Design an enzyme around this catalytic site. Structure first.
Site, PDB file in Angstrom:
ATOM      1  N   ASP A  68       0.882  -1.164   0.000  1.00 19.35           N
ATOM      2  CA  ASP A  68       0.000   0.000   0.000  1.00 19.35           C
ATOM      3  C   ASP A  68       0.920   1.215   0.000  1.00 19.35           C
ATOM      4  O   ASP A  68       1.550   1.531   1.012  1.00 19.35           O
ATOM      5  CB  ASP A  68      -0.884  -0.031   1.243  1.00 19.35           C
ATOM      6  N   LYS A 122       2.493  11.418  -3.799  1.00 17.15           N
ATOM      7  CA  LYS A 122       1.351  10.782  -4.453  1.00 17.15           C
ATOM      8  C   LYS A 122       0.378  11.799  -5.039  1.00 17.15           C
ATOM      9  O   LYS A 122      -0.364  11.465  -5.969  1.00 17.15           O
ATOM     10  CB  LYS A 122       0.620   9.891  -3.447  1.00 17.15           C
ATOM     11  N   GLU A 175      -7.221   0.471  -4.512  1.00 17.38           N
ATOM     12  CA  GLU A 175      -7.297   0.355  -3.056  1.00 17.38           C
ATOM     13  C   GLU A 175      -8.608  -0.242  -2.551  1.00 17.38           C
ATOM     14  O   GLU A 175      -8.557  -1.141  -1.694  1.00 17.38           O
ATOM     15  CB  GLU A 175      -6.950   1.701  -2.396  1.00 17.38           C
ATOM     16  N   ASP A 226     -12.989   4.886   3.538  1.00 15.06           N
ATOM     17  CA  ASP A 226     -11.529   4.982   3.624  1.00 15.06           C
ATOM     18  C   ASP A 226     -11.148   6.401   4.046  1.00 15.06           C
ATOM     19  O   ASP A 226     -11.180   7.323   3.232  1.00 15.06           O
ATOM     20  CB  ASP A 226     -10.911   4.615   2.279  1.00 15.06           C
TER      21      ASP A 226
END
Ligand SMILES: Nc1ncnc2c1ncn2[C@@H]1O[C@H](COP(=O)(O)OP(=O)(O)O)[C@@H](O)[C@H]1O
Ligand SMILES: [Cl-]
Ligand SMILES: [K+]
Ligand SMILES: [Mg+2]
Length: 378
Positions: free
Chosen positions: A7, A68, A172, A196
């Site tokens: 991850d 990211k 994800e 999430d």
């Protein structure tokens, strides 16, 4: 030779391995089961992970994070232009691609976001190799469902740079569902909600799974809502407390604020398992120590609007998926901030008492599913 699941997170990264019939999430050299997605450059070394995050206050211009948010984007992307206004490090334009510019070993250098992320991935690879005892060469790496072809390409390139054969890039929310074994039944639609809430972003995904095939029915969320915003509420609270107690304002001292923020993140994590936390910062400002405490109830009050704001994207996602609450079979918690008891209460209440899938640490669920899928692909 086991393959790994990684991850690669906006704020923290996590690696696991499926070995001997089960997944193990692999702790780093400091014993932490997740590692900050941070890279630091000094006059003498490149630091990655905990070592980088632990010196962020000493070195803000050369401590890179949030790569990211840049990866696979063009420099003129309005996301890049907007996000860069708030980072302490420099972003420059190299042929309409963003690069992060730092000083390292006395010289100015620039790195593409995928190069920064490759360093984070190298750390995760080494974390796994120290646990396994042999070199790791194959990996599944996860990305947000919203990632486009260019963002997926650049994440795969980060893996290649780290020396990994990237078996697959998977979303994800799909990885989280795989972690809970939600794709093992045959014919028959199963509706799954992935909630999430991480360190920097909030993502709700509604998936329909039918005979192992995943279909995204709806997505929602906020790319700038996460645990860091809860830390910031605590920081402002303690800045005010310090002003009352010592009649000094620390808010303009960049080092003191960053060190108070670190203590606030730690206290926040403690409040997910205890009802009170202590903060003890030595020499916070002008040699004044700051020893205080915070209750869970006070923390919830300081963030009550932020916690509640997560339910509207759930409502919106359900609307776009044409599903009622009662039609969701499984509610899967992902992201470190879903460990907050108040957040869980809000979501469970919203679903009228439904169970939450939280037996896997939510900040590890994506890596866990990625590790399962890496083993399956072999
Ligand atoms: N026990 C906990 N209670 C509350 N927040 C936590 C806990 N553990 C981690 N967090 C928070 O989770 C966030 C990071 O989430 P994570 O899912 O690990 O990374 P990412 O957001 O990069 O995917 C941070 O804000 C961190 O402080
Ligand atoms: Cl480490
Ligand atoms: K993560
Ligand atoms: Mg995450």
């Amino acid at each position: 030779a086991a393959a790994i699941g990684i991850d690669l997170g906006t704020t923290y990264s996590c690696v696991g391995v499926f070995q001997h019939g089960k997944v193990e999430i692999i702790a780093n050299d400091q014993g932490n089961r997740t590692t900050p997605s941070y890279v630091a450059f000094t006059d003498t070394e490149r630091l990655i992970g905990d070592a980088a995050k632990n010196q962020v206050a000493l070195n803000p211009q050369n401590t890179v994070f949030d790569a990211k948010r840049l990866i696979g984007r063009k420099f003129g992307d309005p996301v890049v232009q907007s996000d860069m206004k708030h980072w302490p490090f420099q972003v420059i334009n190299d042929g309409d691609k963003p690069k992060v510019q730092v000083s390292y070993k006395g010289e100015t250098k620039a790195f593409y976001p995928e190069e920064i992320s490759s360093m984070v991935l190298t750390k995760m690879k080494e974390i796994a190799e120290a646990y396994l005892g042999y070199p790791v060469t194959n990996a599944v790496i996860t990305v947000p469902a919203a990632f486009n072809d260019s963002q997926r390409q650049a994440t795969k390139d980060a893996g290649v740079i780290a020396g990994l054969n990237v078996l697959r890039i998977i979303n994800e929310p799909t990885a989280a569902a795989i972690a809970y074994g939600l794709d093992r039944t045959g014919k028959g639609e199963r509706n799954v909600l992935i909630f999430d809430l991480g360190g920097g972003t909030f993502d709700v995904s509604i998936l329909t799974i039918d005979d192992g095939i995943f279909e995204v029915k709806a997505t929602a969320g906020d790319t700038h809502l996460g645990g860091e915003d809860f830390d910031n509420r605590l920081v402002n609270h303690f800045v005010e407390e310090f002003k009352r107690k010592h009649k000094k304002d620390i808010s303009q001292n960049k080092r003191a604020v960053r060190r108070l923020r670190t203590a606030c993140e730690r206290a926040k994590r403690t409040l997910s398992s205890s009802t009170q936390a202590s903060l003890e910062i030595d020499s916070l400002f002008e040699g004044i120590d700051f020893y205080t405490s915070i209750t869970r109830a006070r923390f919830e009050e300081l963030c009550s609007d932020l916690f509640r704001s997560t339910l509207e994207p759930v409502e919106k996602a359900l609307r776009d998926a044409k599903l009622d609450k009662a039609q969701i079979h499984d509610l899967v918690l992902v992201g470190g901030s879903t460990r907050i008891p108040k957040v869980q209460k809000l979501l469970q209440d919203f679903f009228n008492g439904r169970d939450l899938n939280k037996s896997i640490n939510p900040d590890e669920a994506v890596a866990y599913g990625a590790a399962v899928q890496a083993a399956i692909l072999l």
